[PDB]
Amino acid sequence: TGRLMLAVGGAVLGSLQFGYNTGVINAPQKVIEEFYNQTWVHRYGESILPTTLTTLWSLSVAIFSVGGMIGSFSVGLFVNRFGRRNSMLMMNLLAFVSAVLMGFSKLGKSFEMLILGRFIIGVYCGLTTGFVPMYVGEVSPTALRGALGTLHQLGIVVGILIAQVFGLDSIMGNKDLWPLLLSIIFIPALLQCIVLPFCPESPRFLLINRNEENRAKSVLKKLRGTADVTHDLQEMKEESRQMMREKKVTILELFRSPAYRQPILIAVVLQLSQQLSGINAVFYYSTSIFEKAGVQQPVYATIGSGIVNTAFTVVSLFVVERAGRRTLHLIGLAGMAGCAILMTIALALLEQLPWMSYLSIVAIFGFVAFFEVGPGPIPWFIVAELFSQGPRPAAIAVAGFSNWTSNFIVGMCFQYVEQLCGPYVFIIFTVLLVLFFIFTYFKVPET
Numbered sequence: 119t120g121r122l123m124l125a126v127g128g129a130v131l132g133s134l135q136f137g138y139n140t141g142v143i144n145a146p147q148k149v150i151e152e153f154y155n156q157t158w159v160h161r162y163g164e165s166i167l168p169t170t171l172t173t174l175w176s177l178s179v180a181i182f183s184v185g186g187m188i189g190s191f192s193v194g195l196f197v198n199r200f201g202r203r204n205s206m207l208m209m210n211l212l213a214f215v216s217a218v219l220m221g222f223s224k225l226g227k228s229f230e231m232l233i234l235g236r237f238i239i240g241v242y243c244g245l246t247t248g249f250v251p252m253y254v255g256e257v258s259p260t261a262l263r264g265a266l267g268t269l270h271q272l273g274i275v276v277g278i279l280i281a282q283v284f285g286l287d288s289i290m291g292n293k294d295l296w297p298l299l300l301s302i303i304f305i306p307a308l309l310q311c312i313v314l315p316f317c318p319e320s321p322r323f324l325l326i327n328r329n330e331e332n333r334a335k336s337v338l339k340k341l342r343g344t345a346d347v348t349h350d351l352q353e354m355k356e357e358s359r360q361m362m363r364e365k366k367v368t369i370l371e372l373f374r375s376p377a378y379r380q381p382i383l384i385a386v387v388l389q390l391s392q393q394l395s396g397i398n399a400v401f402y403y404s405t406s407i408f409e410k411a412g413v414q415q416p417v418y419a420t421i422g423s424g425i426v427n428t429a430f431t432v433v434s435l436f437v438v439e440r441a442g443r444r445t446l447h448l449i450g451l452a453g454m455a456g457c458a459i460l461m462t463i464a465l466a467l468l469e470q471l472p473w474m475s476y477l478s479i480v481a482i483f484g485f486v487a488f489f490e491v492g493p494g495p496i497p498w499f500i501v502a503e504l505f506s507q508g509p510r511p512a513a514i515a516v517a518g519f520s521n522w523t524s525n526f527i528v529g530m531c532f533q534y535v536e537q538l539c540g541p542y543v544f545i546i547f548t549v550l551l552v553l554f555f556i557f558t559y560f561k562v563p564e565t
């Protein structure tokens with residue numbers, strides 16, 4: 119419990135860095151867009167086209183999700199081959215590579231570097247979100263396993279907040295220091311590169327994946343702190359039974375078996391309902407949507423959304439263990455729909471009532487607050503509770519693919535939709551939120 123605080127906190131750095139890379143490109147949108155325009159002129163002696171500037175900066179934020187897909191797929195590769203700890207350590211290379219790329223992108227007069235860096239760091243984020251939850255789950259005692267695993271969640275939302283803070287004009291969200299805003303991630307990396315080597319390899323890797331039972335003994339005693347461990351050791355060997363009991367099934371075997379075709383449908387749709395709700399429409403373009411509203415100091419409203427977001431995350435902890443998954447997920451979609459509607463009213467009546475800009479802030483706060491209690495965590499609780507230890511692994515990969523894919527559809531196309539639909543964009547979210555509300559009220563069983 120003492121030395122334990124090192125290995126965990128050392129791993130959560132990746133989840134901080136995960137959330138940081140997610141929301142850094144929110145506030146400094148205009149300045150980087152100005153840099154694209156600046157770079158476009160220097161090359162061709164011509165101001166960039168507005169539609170091109172759209173899909174270009176959209177690609178710069180969207181390509182990140184593409185990396186995450188690949189990353190989340192490759193987690194199984196490095197984990198069982200190089201170990202949990204060492205996997206997290208070596209993959210800090212992607213951060214330094216990406217940090218340098220996104221940092222010297224301005225000094226290199228190239229948005230390709232920035233896009234490329236955004237891809238690479240996306241892979242790291244996809245890999246990391248597979249490492250951290252798995253590492254702490256094996257390192258922590260079973261008692262604190264259902265509590266320390268929270269730090270991954272908190273890490274992301276807090277990382278998103280810090281990204282939005284630094285996104286201020288006062289700090290790093292400006293003409294001169296935006297390349298550093300993207301690069302500062304090297305600090306967390308450098309820290310994790312120092313800490314992890316002192317942290318212990320997971321015993322479940324030493325006991326199972328290496329059969330080095332003896333090398334695992336020295337871990338738990340220093341790790342768990344307890345002198346003896348002739349019960350935690352037997353535990354893992356008894357929990358590995360259930361994990362090795364029924365045969366694990368592959369991805370494409372999940373599609374072909376009509377026994378698995380119904381629960382998988384629920385899983386994927388529940389992931390679509392998380393992204394196509396359009397919470398990344400705000401976590402990527404909060405400061406942008408606020409600008410089209412009459413919001414004074416919009417970057418602060420984004421930080422507001424971060425704090426509200428971070429807040430209701432902690433609230434959700436003391437709710438999932440108090441209510442049902444079917445209910446909480448329904449509550450979310452409704453509130454997200456209501457707020458999406460309420461958002462449209464603000465964006466519509468602003469031109470008539472020069473103050474509804476304040477309503478848009480409250481709407482989006484509720485739009486993300488209702489998300490973090492319903493469609494936030496639940497879509498990952500239902501999937502893990504619709505499949506036994508055999509097909510459950512393959513189900514996460516599909517769900518993971520479903521999430522990244524639908525995440526890319528929003529972040530890449532939301533601006534193209536924002537131009538044509540005008541103040542009537544959140545209706546798309548409202549509409550889909552209804553379909554997702556119908557789909558769950560009938561076809562989603564409580565667990």
Ligand SMILES: C=C1[C@@H](C)[C@H]2[C@H](Cc3ccccc3)NC(=O)[C@]23OC(=O)/C=C/[C@H](O)CCC[C@@H](C)C/C=C/[C@H]3[C@@H]1O
Binds near residue numbers: 398493
């Ligand atoms: C906006 C988002 C962010 C906010 C989350 C979103 C909400 C959430 C928050 C806390 C716990 C579980 C879910 N639900 C997510 O899953 C979330 O990433 C995670 O936080 C955890 C991801 C796990 O590693 C498994 C999936 C890891 C990836 C395959 C998918 C990651 C999704 C992101 C999502 O983009």
